[PDB]
Amino acid sequence: MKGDKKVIQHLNKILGNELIAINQYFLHSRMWNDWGLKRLGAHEYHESIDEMKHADKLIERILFLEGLPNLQDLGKLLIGENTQEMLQCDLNLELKATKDLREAIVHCEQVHDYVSRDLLKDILESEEEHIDYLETQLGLIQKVGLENYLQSHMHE
Template sequence: MKGKKRVLEQLQQLLAGELAARDQYFIHSRMYDDWGLHRLYERIHHEMEDETGHADSLIKRILFLEGVPDLSEQEKLHVGKTVPEMLQNDLDVEYQVVTALKKAIAICEEERDFQTREILEVMLDDTEEDHAYWLEKQLGLIKRVGLKNYLQSQMGDDGGS
C-alpha cells in the first residue's frame, strides 16, 4: 500500500527520535548499572526496550507504506553526567517525542491515514502516561527527599551480578 509522502516523512522523523531515545536510554542505563543504581538501571533498561519497540513499529509501518526506513539519521543524544541531569535529559526527549507524535497524528488525520494514526496514538499514550510521567515522578522525588536519599533508594539488589 503506497503511503502518502507527508505521512512517510513524519514516520521517518519519529523514527529518528525513537532511535536517539533508545540510544540515550541505553547509555544512561549502563551508567546507572556501573554506579550501582540497580533500580534505575532496570527501569531505564526497560525504557530502552520500549523505545526499540516503538522504532520497530515505525519501521514496519514505513515498509508497509512502501517507504524505506533510514536508520542512519537520528536526533542528537544528550548524555547526562549526574542522575538529575540524566533524568531531565530523558524527560526532555520524551517531551520532544510527544510534540512530534501529536504533529504526526494531526498529519495522519489530514491525510486520512487512520491506521497509522492509531499506531501513533498507542505510542503517544505510552510516552505520555508511562515514560514522561515516571521521569517527572523521579525528579519530584529528588526534590522532596533529597538526592542522597533518592540515590540510596535506587541501589536495590543487583541480582547477583
C-alpha cells in the same frame, strides 16, 4: 499499500526520535548499573526496550506503506553526567518527541491514514507514561533529597 508521502516523512521523523531514545536510554542504564544504582539501571533498561519496540513498529509500518525506513541519521544524544541531569535529559527528549507525535497525528487525520494515527497514538500513550515516570522521579528527589533517592535505587 501506496501510502501518503508526507505521512511517511513524519513516520521517519518519529523513528528518528526513537533511535535517539534507544541509544540515550541504554547508555543511561549502563551508567547507573556501573555506579551501583541498579534499580535506576534496570528501569531505564526497560525504557530502552520500549523505545526499541516503538522503532520496530514504525519501521514495519513505513515498509508496508512502501517507504524507506531511515536508520542512518541520528540526532544529538543528551547524555547527562549525574542522576538528575540524566532524568531531565530523558524528559526533554520525551517532551520534544511528543510535539512531533502530535503534528504527525494531525497529518494522518487530514489524509485519512487512520491506521497510522492509531499506531502513533499508541506510541503517544507510552511516551506520556515515560514522561509521568520522569517527572515523578524529579519530584521525589526534591521531596526525599538526593541522597535518600539514590539510596532507595541502589538495590533491586
